[PDB]
Amino acid sequence: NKGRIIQVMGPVVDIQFESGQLPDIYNAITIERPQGGTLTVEAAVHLGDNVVRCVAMASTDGLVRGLEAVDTGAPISVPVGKATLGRVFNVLGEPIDEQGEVNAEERHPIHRPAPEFEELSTADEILETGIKVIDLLAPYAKGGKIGLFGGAGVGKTVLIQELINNVAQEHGGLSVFAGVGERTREGNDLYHEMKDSGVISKTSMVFGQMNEPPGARLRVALTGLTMAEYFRDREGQDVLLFIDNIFRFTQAGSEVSALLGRMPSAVGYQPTLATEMGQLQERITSTKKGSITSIQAIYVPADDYTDPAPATTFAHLDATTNLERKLAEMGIYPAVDPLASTSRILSPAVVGEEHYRVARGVQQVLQRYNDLQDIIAILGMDELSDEDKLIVARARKIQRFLSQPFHVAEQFTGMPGKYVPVKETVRGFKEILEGKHDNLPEEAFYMVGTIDEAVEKAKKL
Amino acid sequence: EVGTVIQVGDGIARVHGLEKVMAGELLEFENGVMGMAQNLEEDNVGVVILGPYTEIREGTQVKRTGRIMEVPVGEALLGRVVNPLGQPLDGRGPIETAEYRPIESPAPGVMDRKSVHEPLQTGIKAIDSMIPIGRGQRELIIGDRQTGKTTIAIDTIINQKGQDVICIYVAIGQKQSTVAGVVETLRQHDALDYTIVVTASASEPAPLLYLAPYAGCAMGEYFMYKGKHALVVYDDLSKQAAAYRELSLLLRRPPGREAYPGDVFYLHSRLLERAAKLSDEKGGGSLTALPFIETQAGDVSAYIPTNVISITDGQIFLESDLFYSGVRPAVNVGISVSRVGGAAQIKAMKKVAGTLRLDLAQYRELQAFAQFGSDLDKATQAKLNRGERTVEILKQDEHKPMPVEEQVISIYAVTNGFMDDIPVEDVRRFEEELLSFMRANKDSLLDHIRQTGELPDTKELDAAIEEFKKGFTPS
Amino acid sequence: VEVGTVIQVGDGIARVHGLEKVMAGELLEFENGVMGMAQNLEEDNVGVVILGPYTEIREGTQVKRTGRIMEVPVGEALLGRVVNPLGQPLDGRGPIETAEYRPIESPAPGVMDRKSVHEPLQTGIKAIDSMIPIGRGQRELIIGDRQTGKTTIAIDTIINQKGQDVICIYVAIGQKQSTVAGVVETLRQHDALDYTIVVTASASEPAPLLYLAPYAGCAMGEYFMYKGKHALVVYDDLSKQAAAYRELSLLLRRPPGREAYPGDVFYLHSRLLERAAKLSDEKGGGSLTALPFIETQAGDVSAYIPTNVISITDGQIFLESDLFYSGVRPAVNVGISVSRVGGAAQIKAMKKVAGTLRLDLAQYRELQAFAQFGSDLDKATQAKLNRGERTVEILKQDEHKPMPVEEQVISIYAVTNGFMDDIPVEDVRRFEEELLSFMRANKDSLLDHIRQTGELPDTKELDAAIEEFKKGFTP
Ligand SMILES: Nc1ncnc2c1ncn2[C@@H]1O[C@H](COP(=O)(O)OP(=O)(O)O)[C@@H](O)[C@H]1O
Ligand SMILES: Nc1ncnc2c1ncn2[C@@H]1O[C@H](COP(=O)(O)OP(=O)(O)O)[C@@H](O)[C@H]1O
Ligand SMILES: Nc1ncnc2c1ncn2[C@@H]1O[C@H](COP(=O)(O)OP(=O)(O)O)[C@@H](O)[C@H]1O
Ligand SMILES: [Mg+2]
Ligand SMILES: [Mg+2]
Numbered sequence A: 001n002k003g004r005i006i007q008v009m010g011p012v013v014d015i016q017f018e019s020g021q022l023p024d025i026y027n028a029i030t031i032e033r034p035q036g037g038t039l040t041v042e043a044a045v046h047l048g049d050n051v052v053r054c055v056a057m058a059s060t061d062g063l064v065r066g067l068e069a070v071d072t073g074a075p076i077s078v079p080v081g082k083a084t085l086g087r088v089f090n091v092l093g094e095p096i097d098e099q100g101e102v103n104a105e106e107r108h109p110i111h112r113p114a115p116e117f118e119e120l121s122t123a124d125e126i127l128e129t130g131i132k133v134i135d136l137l138a139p140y141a142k143g144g145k146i147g148l149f150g151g152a153g154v155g156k157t158v159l160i161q162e163l164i165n166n167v168a169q170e171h172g173g174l175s176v177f178a179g180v181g182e183r184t185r186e187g188n189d190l191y192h193e194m195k196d197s198g199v200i201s202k203t204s205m206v207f208g209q210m211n212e213p214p215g216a217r218l219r220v221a222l223t224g225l226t227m228a229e230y231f232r233d234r235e236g237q238d239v240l241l242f243i244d245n246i247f248r249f250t251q252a253g254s255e256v257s258a259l260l261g262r263m264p265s266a267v268g269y270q271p272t273l274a275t276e277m278g279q280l281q282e283r284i285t286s287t288k289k290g291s292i293t294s295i296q297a298i299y300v301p302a303d304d305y306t307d308p309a310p311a312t313t314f315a316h317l318d319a320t321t322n323l324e325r326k327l328a329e330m331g332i333y334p335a336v337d338p339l340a341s342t343s344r345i346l347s348p349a350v351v352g353e354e355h356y357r358v359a360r361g362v363q364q365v366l367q368r369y370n371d372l373q374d375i376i377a378i379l380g381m382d383e384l385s386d387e388d389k390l391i392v393a394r395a396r397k398i399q400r401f402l403s404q405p406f407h408v409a410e411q412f413t414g415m416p417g418k419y420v421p422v423k424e425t426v427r428g429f430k431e432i433l434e435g436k437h438d439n440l441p442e443e444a445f446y447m448v449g450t451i452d453e454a455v456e457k458a459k460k461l
Numbered sequence B: 001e002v003g004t005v006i007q008v009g010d011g012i013a014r015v016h017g018l019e020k021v022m023a024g025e026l027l028e029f030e031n032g033v034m035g036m037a038q039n040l041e042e043d044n045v046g047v048v049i050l051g052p053y054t055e056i057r058e059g060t061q062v063k064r065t066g067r068i069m070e071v072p073v074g075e076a077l078l079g080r081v082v083n084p085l086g087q088p089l090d091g092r093g094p095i096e097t098a099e100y101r102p103i104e105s106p107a108p109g110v111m112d113r114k115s116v117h118e119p120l121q122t123g124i125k126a127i128d129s130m131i132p133i134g135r136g137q138r139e140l141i142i143g144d145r146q147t148g149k150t151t152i153a154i155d156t157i158i159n160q161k162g163q164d165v166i167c168i169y170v171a172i173g174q175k176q177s178t179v180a181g182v183v184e185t186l187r188q189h190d191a192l193d194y195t196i197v198v199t200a201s202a203s204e205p206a207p208l209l210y211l212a213p214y215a216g217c218a219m220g221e222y223f224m225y226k227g228k229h230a231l232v233v234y235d236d237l238s239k240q241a242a243a244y245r246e247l248s249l250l251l252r253r254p255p256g257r258e259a260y261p262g263d264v265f266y267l268h269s270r271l272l273e274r275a276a277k278l279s280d281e282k283g284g285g286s287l288t289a290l291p292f293i294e295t296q297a298g299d300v301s302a303y304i305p306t307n308v309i310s311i312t313d314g315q316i317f318l319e320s321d322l323f324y325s326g327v328r329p330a331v332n333v334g335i336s337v338s339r340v341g342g343a344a345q346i347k348a349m350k351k352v353a354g355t356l357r358l359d360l361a362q363y364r365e366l367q368a369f370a371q372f373g374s375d376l377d378k379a380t381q382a383k384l385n386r387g388e389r390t391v392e393i394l395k396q397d398e399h400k401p402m403p404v405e406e407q408v409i410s411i412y413a414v415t416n417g418f419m420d421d422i423p424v425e426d427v428r429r430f431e432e433e434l435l436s437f438m439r440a441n442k443d444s445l446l447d448h449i450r451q452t453g454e455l456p457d458t459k460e461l462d463a464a465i466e467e468f469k470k471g472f473t474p475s
Numbered sequence C: 001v002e003v004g005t006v007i008q009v010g011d012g013i014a015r016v017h018g019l020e021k022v023m024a025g026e027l028l029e030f031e032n033g034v035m036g037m038a039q040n041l042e043e044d045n046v047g048v049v050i051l052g053p054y055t056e057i058r059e060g061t062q063v064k065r066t067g068r069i070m071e072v073p074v075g076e077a078l079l080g081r082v083v084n085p086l087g088q089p090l091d092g093r094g095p096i097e098t099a100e101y102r103p104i105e106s107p108a109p110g111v112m113d114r115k116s117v118h119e120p121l122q123t124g125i126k127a128i129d130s131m132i133p134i135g136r137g138q139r140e141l142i143i144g145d146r147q148t149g150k151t152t153i154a155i156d157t158i159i160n161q162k163g164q165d166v167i168c169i170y171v172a173i174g175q176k177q178s179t180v181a182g183v184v185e186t187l188r189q190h191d192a193l194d195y196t197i198v199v200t201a202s203a204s205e206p207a208p209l210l211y212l213a214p215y216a217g218c219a220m221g222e223y224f225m226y227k228g229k230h231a232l233v234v235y236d237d238l239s240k241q242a243a244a245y246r247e248l249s250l251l252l253r254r255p256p257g258r259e260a261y262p263g264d265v266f267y268l269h270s271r272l273l274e275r276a277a278k279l280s281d282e283k284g285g286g287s288l289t290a291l292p293f294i295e296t297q298a299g300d301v302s303a304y305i306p307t308n309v310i311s312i313t314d315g316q317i318f319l320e321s322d323l324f325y326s327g328v329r330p331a332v333n334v335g336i337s338v339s340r341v342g343g344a345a346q347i348k349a350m351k352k353v354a355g356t357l358r359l360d361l362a363q364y365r366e367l368q369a370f371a372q373f374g375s376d377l378d379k380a381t382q383a384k385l386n387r388g389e390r391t392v393e394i395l396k397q398d399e400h401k402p403m404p405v406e407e408q409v410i411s412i413y414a415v416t417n418g419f420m421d422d423i424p425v426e427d428v429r430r431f432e433e434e435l436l437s438f439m440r441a442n443k444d445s446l447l448d449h450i451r452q453t454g455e456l457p458d459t460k461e462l463d464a465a466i467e468e469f470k471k472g473f474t475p
Helices: A132-137 A156-171 A184-197 A214-233 A246-259 A273-281 A308-314 A325-330 A353-379 A386-401 A407-413 A422-434 A451-459 B125-130 B149-159 B176-188 B206-225 B237-250 B264-273 B303-311 B320-324 B347-352 B356-369 B378-394 B404-415 B424-441 B443-452 B458-469 C126-131 C150-160 C177-189 C207-225 C238-251 C265-274 C304-312 C321-325 C348-371 C379-395 C405-416 C425-442 C444-453 C459-470
Strands: A002-009 A012-017 A027-032 A038-048 A051-056 A068-075 A077-079 A107-109 A145-149 A175-182 A203-209 A238-244 A291-296 A317-322 B002-009 B012-017 B025-029 B034-040 B044-049 B061-068 B070-072 B100-102 B140-143 B166-172 B195-200 B229-235 B286-294 B314-318 C004-010 C013-018 C026-030 C035-041 C046-050 C062-069 C071-073 C101-103 C141-144 C166-173 C196-201 C230-236 C287-295 C315-319
Touching (some): A012 A038, A077 A214, A107 A214, A132 A422, A145 A156, A156 A175, A156 A184, A175 A246, A184 A203, A184 A407, A214 A273, A214 A291, A238 A246, A246 A273, A246 A308, A273 A308, A273 B237, A353 A386, A353 A422, B125 B356, B125 B378, B140 B303, B149 B166, B149 B176, B149 B286, B149 B314, B166 B176, B195 B206, B206 B229, B206 B237, B206 B286, B237 B264, B237 B303, B264 B303, B286 B303, B347 B404, B356 B378, B378 B404, B378 B424, B404 B424, B404 B443, B404 B458, C013 C062, C046 C207, C141 C150, C150 C230, C166 C177, C177 C196, C238 C265, C238 C304, C265 C287, C265 C304, C348 C379, C348 C405, C379 C405, C405 C425, C405 C459
Parallel strands (some): A145 A291, A175 A203, B166 B229, B229 B286, C141 C287, C141 C315
Antiparallel strands (some): A002 C035, A012 A051, A027 A038, A027 A068, A038 B002, B002 B012, B012 B044, B034 B044, B070 B100, C004 C062, C026 C035, C071 C101
């Protein structure tokens, strides 16, 4: 199924085919380079006169008009299943870790409709992470999207690895990391970081790096998602898809829209902003066979949450995890802001009546303590009422009991990590609020798992 | 009556042939996917594809259907989940119906209507008392994401159980998981058998999101023009407008404010004018509309929100600060309004609620200066104490609609001072305990209201509440 | 050769018939010896961007293929020379004697060819080396308005590589040529020119040379990286490069987007900056460190090109006018500026002492509101303000006066452990200068410990030596 290159204009290639045999939109098309190697290219527009405008997935330098181009007959198709685990891929599904070929039985196409209405889970289900702060105050939901805020050096990668570990240990689900505009240096660091913590073997990795053309960065997330879809649909797993950064997916969309000549929408974004996002996001969902939970780092241009990029991304989020440097500097790890983090499924309907009551109780105490921080610093502790002094006491214990040693820090801290189930997290914080541990010293609650381990640590002090 | 595709991109195709095609005609592509003739040019046709378009290319063939853009209609849709073309998504097989209705259709003219006078009870105290909706009204539900908009419409549909009102939930641009959740919630409250569900999920091509509200409108119109009463929910028109912008920009139509086309107002105005209350001569039927707008950071002065505000007969604004502080439903009393008003209310409710909105608007303003407990003058002290209690009454749990007769008693109780000696934290339990008492023991009073629509004898009612009070233990 | 003929010419672009077999990006020669580059391979012409005078090119002029992608001369012959992006000498000191060439476009080191950045690139600027540390293989953006001190940071950084065995490349895109002559002269006087290559596409040059200038400099530095040596490249600035590539893209009628830039303007910078890296031990251990520049307008860091380059690099140094004019020079916003590599690019001594500087200034910046309330404040916050103003004075630093890291560690150690708390704020900078001349002359065994081990000396010996100096200091 053959074609001739008629035009080359940056990362856009116009290819002429013969009358009856024009590739479908989104089909992969290969061109053998004169210099050696293959350039893969994705069909975008049917211009007429049997021409297709296509978006390149690598450099078009060195191409010549009149070269042969071959329709592969389907979209970009990518390895799935157990052969992907522990490996590092590019957008095309080719391995880039220099560990030879990937002997996978199947290759699935990266473009695909969203799951049918009949296939959908019809009730919100909590995804237990084993991490106290998250499970209690801003729980992750099985079908759902989670927005991961936090700057440099607050614990993003450590947290993402611990989630890979704890989904793998206890629910037996796998993970995929999609680096959308990954910086090559930081891909290399993340590979070695995951190899050392051992989480690598539970995770497929896909990098569409900052130096690749827009097409690559636009579609690399779909490559990762396609791998996760296998583990959901054909091994009934609860799967984690990590995307860093989902803004760069939207930005690559606007870059490619510009080169296709499309009229811009509000704030210069592509007119297909919402639909392009929906085609990615709606595939991340819980079906009857299993679940994909997505955990997405989200850039906010000009600090403006009303900007079309984050505004459209926000419509799909179920939860947020706000990492704050202030907490990291105090030694509270994971450094999750227990007031700023939120979840749509922290409601009595989904977690129990008790869970909700406890979580709101915890947040009330923390909020009050936060309000008194200024008053305490100046007027001192004698100025507070007896009710407030008791709240400050508990707030400080609560704040420490939200910290937790991670399995993936076992090498660095030298202390064993802890998985704490939801039942135990709720029980622990319930008891602190009730006053059952007002006589334990504060250090007892710091870096422990269950409430029982805090009682045990008190004896050692 | 065939044509061939000359050019395609982004779900828009130019087609050679189809010489005899109508403007707005439904077309079928070679692979079963439908389309719509939009532009009749000198020797080609502009066609918008209404479904998956990867398998459509240059050379694909297109058949006319000889039918203007239409949806299947009638009783066969009740309890079914369909897309904007009327194709069943729930996997319970075909939609057996002989009646169709066109997606674009003229609105009832100036002489075909009657003033709205019949209640549509939402079952939500805050709404039915302060922002009353009537049959034939268009009432905008507007607010940020996660302020409780969808739950208002779901609760309203549920409360139409046994009121002989056909409901249509149109889901434009939502996540499909959410839509699956909605149908399941309706099933469990036994509200699905009188409800049609139209859905253009976020992954669907823009033209389906564009058409979804018009399809739902036609489905409800059918019942209106046969003298029955319907309710349509568009959740939401923000995403529909964005989809129509995508479409307009792909056709290179000049952008204006926020890149929307000039006719984006017309998009919503034609839709919402088709909802109405018909005259006695035209059968007396009604179509009531609840369009949704999703604001960004509470900006009600943005382009699309102002358009839809200027179209509808009032709005219910939901505010984030109220929502996250535990005032749910989170109705901003100052901004919200019903242009129909007391006309859409039973006389009992119009009496007890008369000044309720203005009373709470004054409460919320005066609440800023409430730090002076015991120091503040006794007039304002009492107003704040009455206010906190009425706020507690207007809080209301999700999926728990209240009959009108029970709302009138509860609002009567608090507004005539019967909870002034009760702790603020006990007010909500006092209400629940009061109504179970009224149902079990004083049903003759409740029944008066359901039959006459009037308050019972105020002396009998005062006595009955004070009777209940003597068996109530505070904390 | 096959030849081609020029159809149209204007504004440094020609459209050429023929040349059927030409490659995208191929070098072409016009009849009169002027070179060009094939940019757009169109259905019935080739778009060719002219790399020289274009007045003598007309309709009919003939164009020959060369069969070659762009290359530039490379190696040790370029050191101390001033060249254009084609490698031709502009300083008028005759030819560049070199047998080695290298292609201007070249693939970046892949994911497996690298090692985590771990080796310092000392700028000699306290503010940077302590708070925003740069490492060998890092890309660190220098961003700020005009006249905020960006070029002087890079010039001082180059000067500080004297005797560090680091080859420097200053790429000057779009500058006035007099300014570039001024830069080379400043380097000459500080004896930094003999290890520095200077690439220059002045403002009068055709746009394609401004476009290529950074890639030429990159290749010149890559040569040293791939032989296991260490290089530093400065692009001053990428704002003007992007504008030049826009001019070119618009003349070739490639569709404009935000601020009229093409869709691939991000790709333009991302290819460039990813070629700077730290190689693995297997690939020779060499490095190319990059300092790209962005010139903001009115401090708008959210503009299109600035956001692109911020999202590419491994951190940024933001410079502000308000800081500059208040006497904080270099005018580094320490709070907002960032090194994503961090402590990995710092000797252990500096990582230790800088730990406390950061926490001291973070507390200072929070408490700064309370500085007009002098002596009303409690003694804890008073001391935090006094420590803060003193550390600010330490981070001020004269132009063209880089400091060795061993002297920085002592100076930062002094102020962060309280040794300047007794001294007037106006005396702090002289105290530092007098302290270090004392340490060099008398206590060099302590300084040398740091140069050899990279660790702090024994704190008791160090405290004594500073307190010894203090007794001979007069305010
Ligand atoms: N849970 C934790 N326990 C102990 N130390 C942690 C934890 N999380 C992060 N850190 C420390 O902070 C450093 C930076 O965290 P990192 O995961 O690299 O953040 P980011 O991904 O934002 O760069 C880690 O290398 C580690 O020293
Ligand atoms: N009256 C209420 N009581 C308790 N929870 C509510 C109430 N109304 C809404 N919610 C909760 O708030 C969340 C958001 O409400 P929803 O109606 O979906 O808002 P929107 O449709 O504007 O996003 C839902 O998940 C729901 O559980
Ligand atoms: N650290 C400094 N201390 C004093 N003067 C400086 C300093 N840095 C730059 N200058 C002066 O300030 C001006 C800024 O010039 P330059 O370094 O070229 O900044 P830019 O490149 O942002 O325009 C020059 O006149 C220079 O002499
Ligand atoms: Mg909703
Ligand atoms: Mg400068």
